[PDB]
Symmetry: D2
Subunit: 269 residues, 4 copies
């Protein structure tokens, strides 16, 4: 409780449940003296899950499909209403693939499903920032963050069209980082996070834990790092893809990972 975000206002997407990273950013950002507004889809809100978080953080849950420019124009107006003007930061934490959910392989994509994957997981970020820019919703030296994963750089079996969506997301962070930065000094970055619970499940989380010298970064560790990016101490950090993974991105082989791999290869013999 350093009061890092004292007198700072933000919008957080993608708080579903207590386990979700955007949920932890929300409750941890207020803890640091921030006012926030929450958003998710009606089918996400109606369940009644996020409302509980929007009790804790005081503040409101504004319904919006983040792929709908209309829903985003409403979201920004209702967000700016609630704060009584501009805000400082925004957390984008959205992404799913109908290709993954319908069990299509990467060499058997449905291209309507792919358009949805790219729209929900990446273009939504551009849409959210463009609506904000047009309504001048964000103060000078504000901070926009989107969550990403290293499949954007290095292919992960079964992660499918989400890898390509994360690459597109990270590029939008650069492209829009330049425009918003040269104009109003607003910084835009991606945090490339460890695989986190709720093919990003059991065996992969063990591999990444063992490979990473500091182990996997928790959702709480992620929330911790993101606060730094919303603080004035990261003002000159923009257009970056920041690995938050206990060193995973910088590792070829750990002794601990090889010890497991060698057993898989040798144990029987």
């Amino acid at each position: 409780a350093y009061n890092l975000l004292k007198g700072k206002k933000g919008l957080i997407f993608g708080a579903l449940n207590e386990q979700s990273i955007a949920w932890k950013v929300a409750e941890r950002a207020v803890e640091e003296g921030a006012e926030i507004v929450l958003t998710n889809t009606a089918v996400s809100i109606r369940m009644g899950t996020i409302g509980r978080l929007a009790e804790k953080c005081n503040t409101i849950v504004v319904p919006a499909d983040a792929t709908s420019v209309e829903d985003l124009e409403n979201l920004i107006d209702k967000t700016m209403e609630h704060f009584g003007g501009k805000f400082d930061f925004m957390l984008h934490s959205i992404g799913m693939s109908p290709n993954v959910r319908k069990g299509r392989t990467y060499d058997d994509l449905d291209y309507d499903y792919l358009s949805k994957t790219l729209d929900i997981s990446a273009i939504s970020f551009h849409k959210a920032i463009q609506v904000a820019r047009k309504k001048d919703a964000i103060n000078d030296w504000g901070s926009i963050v989107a969550l990403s994963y290293i499949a954007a750089q290095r292919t992960l079996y079964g992660y499918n069209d989400m890898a390509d969506a994360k690459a597109l997301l990270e590029s939008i962070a650069r492209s829009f980082g330049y425009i918003y930065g040269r104009e109003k000094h607003v910084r835009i970055n991606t945090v490339s996070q460890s695989p986190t619970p709720t093919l990003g499940m059991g065996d992969l989380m063990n591999f990444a834990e063992n490979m990473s010298p500091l182990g996997n970064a928790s959702a709480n560790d992620c929330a911790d790092y993101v606060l730094t990016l919303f603080s004035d101490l990261t003002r000159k950090v923009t257009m970056q893809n920041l690995y938050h993974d206990g060193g995973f991105a910088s590792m070829g082989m750990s002794r601990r990972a090889m010890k497991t791999y060698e057993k898989g290869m040798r144990f029987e013999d």
Copy 2:
């Protein structure tokens, strides 16, 4: 004339005119002993230019919208009929942004325009590979190349949504490289080619900018058996640009600009 591609068969997208990289790849690939099939839009073919290349390369041009799975299915069928079965290599050299054409700023995109940008410039690559995979069109140890640009990594003002499309294209090369590679050992790579920006890149690059002729020669290596273990790479072909922070030549021009200010 090394006969690098003797006995090899190729499909080439994006040959428009004599200045096109894809055009130079087609004529160099035939010089190196490859058989090829050309493809572009019906409208491109109708303008009469690509027919000149098909005659020189002793082959056919098959009309296809590369964003249309149906057209790509027809194309792969006609290509395999022309060759009498499977082929070895494929060049994707397509890309266009309606947002750029209409002079839209990056913070005033049309999202229907952006959909077209991504589809023509990136998803068209996935579509062509997936149709080829389903028809088993490509021989084991085949080679697929798409052309890209460093805006995929580093922002160029005014390159607009094409930067994001290139980032997506390069990711498709990796995603599909893994899938096509593990089975049939087909390699998939992007060549990040050279492009006032032209003058800046020329002076920044110790060897100067790569020409379309230069790029054609480099792509031949990737279709050759000599690059069989090179896959899922984004290969800078730019006379050193991607590895430069500042050259003497580029700094001298910039300094003169600071003094005229």
Copy 3:
């Protein structure tokens, strides 16, 4: 003044004068509630410059050639004495090239001078960390930072053998990051900083200012960012080369840089 480094102890190398980045990290780290020890060469101290900073921050200036394992073993003992035990963080900010100073070009190196360049600018970092590790000088979840520059990745005319030294420095951060991390969860990173005053002079600082949407990062901006890395909020950030450059690393061409370049190319005609 968030009290980020409340009850935290560190060692800072390379404070020469008020303009120097390690000087600003020192005075800014105490401001955030840290105790520090200062070090430089006798010829740096004797001038009497750093002593003034070691008045402001209370604490001592311990003389040490950071290329001498003997001087470093003394430094760590005297540092741990002064704190009455282990410390938490360490700032490495050392580097020069006799090749640069004697005006030799990269294709006319003196190889004794190169050994010195690599030793002062990179191997010194390994030496400092190895001495610390052998004396268990650093608490669990401690943070080691070395300052670097993008010439490590992208060649800069006239920057000479320093580019190769920065590449070697950044690699040591990874190599030692893994060892110190898997054992005692100590994180190790490099901050790749903007060109900063005291070929990293006038025309280059203008180019980097114009190219970077947020302009060059100051020594004060750098000190700000480094505090985040010493804080508990970056615990899972290790083996990273972190660009702090107003977006330089992520830029191909800004409108503002091209406006200057086009004048250089066209103005006369």
Copy 4:
């Protein structure tokens, strides 16, 4: 046999035995119509193995400690005498760590050992290029390659100070690439080659690990005129390893390891 290097002349360091990449580069380079000169340490030559390669390649082996500027001066003189003037390409394939040989952990390095590691594995590359530049030994549009490994970017437990030496080697390629390129248009690149680690890399890489034969073929492309605009690059030649996060094959082996635990 493409005659890729017809009329070209090369100097090759690091050929020890039939299994060496440098050995395979020498014999493939001659097959492709190059003339070469071989170099290794006096002690290496005395063991009798490399003389077999010099006979096959119809050439000489010149003794040189590649860390000795004096020996490199003698080598470049003898090479240029053998060829009757300038040559086109050079392969650096040297590297050894006394710290690794003596089983020193990375947090217990000997700094005299580390000096030797850096000198043999990295600075030797600068030394050879600088001596070649001063004697103007290399033709315009020549090609210099050194062999590297991805430990330069991503940490492998037990690869030790060799990881840092590879990071330094790759930086020298860029630093010297710019200087040699701007004048004489000589390209300088590193090839980041494949290497239980061998099994892990084989299963992670969609195409499997690159062999020394594979690497020789790829290096031929970099000595050929077809790669003239490729410089200051670190080129992964690894069947896709550098672009992989996790493969099905690698994950299956790892899963079996988790269950045996």
